[PDB]
C-alpha cells in the first residue's frame, strides 16, 4: 500500500507560485521527511527576492503524508493511502480582519521524491495590515488539525484555526478550510480524528537569500 513508501527517509521538493494583492512571488523548498517519527526538515527560499508576506503565513500551504499515524491509527491515514499517485489539496484561508488565500496543490511522488506543487492567490489584504505590513512574529504555535470523511465525494474535509502571534502582543487568527481528493482510484475514508501539529521556524545565518528553515512534528490521534 502507499504506507510502504514512507518506512524510511523520503526527499521532499516544494514549489509555490503566489500572487497576493498583485504582488507575485515564488518559493522553492527542499528537505526530507520521516513519517515513522512524524518529522519534517525543510529549507525554503523566496526565489523572486524578498517575500511580500510573512513566512509564517505560508507554513500551512508549504505534506501531511509525513504525519506519524500510530499502528492503531493506520487504517485511517488518507494521505498515505492516496500515494504514490497523490492527492489534490485545496484551501481557503481567512485572515481575521484582513484578506484571504486560496490555494490548490498536488502532493504526489515523482520518482523517489515527494513533491508539493502549489498555486496561491491572495486577495482583499490591507497594504499596511499585519500580513502585507509584516507585523507577525517569526514563530509558530501548536495546532490540532481536524479531519473528517467528505460525505459527497471520495476525499477528506479538514478544519483548523491558526494562531499567528503579532509583534504588539495580540494574535492574528487564520481560519483554514481544506479538502483533499485522490489523484488515483478511491481510498477508504477515515473516521473523525485529528493531527497534533508542531512547527518551529528558524534561519540559517550563512544563507543570504530570504528563507525559512522549518522543522515539524506531527502525530495523529483519535477523538477526543
Author numbering: 3 to 64, 68 to 189, 191 to 230
Study authors write:
EGFP is an archetypical autofluorescent protein in terms of structure and function. It comprises a core β-barrel capped at each end. Running through the centre of the barrel is a kinked helix that houses the distinctive p-hydroxybenzylidene-imidazolinone (HBI) chromophore. HBI forms as a result of covalent rearrangement of three residues resident in the central helix (Thr65-Tyr67-Gly68).
In EGFP residue Asp190 is located in a long loop (ten residues) that spans one end of the β-barrel structure linking β-strand S9 to β-strand S10. Thus, the structure of EGFPD190Δ allows us to investigate the structural impact of a deletion in a loop. The crystal structure of EGFPD190Δ encompassed residues Lys3–Thr230. The backbone trace between the two structures starts to diverge after the deleted residue and does not converge back to the general structure until Leu195. This also results in a significant displacement of the side chains of these residues. Therefore, in the present context the main backbone changes are exerted immediately after the deletion and are not propagated either side, with the placement of the flanking β-strands unchanged. However, deletion of Asp190 alters the conformation of this loop, repositioning it so that the backbone N and O atoms of Val193 are within hydrogen-bonding distance of the carboxamide side chain of Asn159 in the adjacent tight turn linking β-strands S7 and S8. This results in the linkage of different secondary-structure elements in EGFPD190Δ (S9–S10 loop to S7–S8 tight turn) compared with EGFP (H3 to S9–S10 loop), potentially being the reason for the reduced B factors of residues in these secondary-structure elements in EGFPD190Δ. Overall, there is a net gain of one hydrogen bond between the residues in EGFPD190Δ compared with EGFP. Thus, the deletion of a residue within a loop does not just cause general loop shortening: a whole host of local and long-range interactions are lost and formed so as to accommodate such a change.
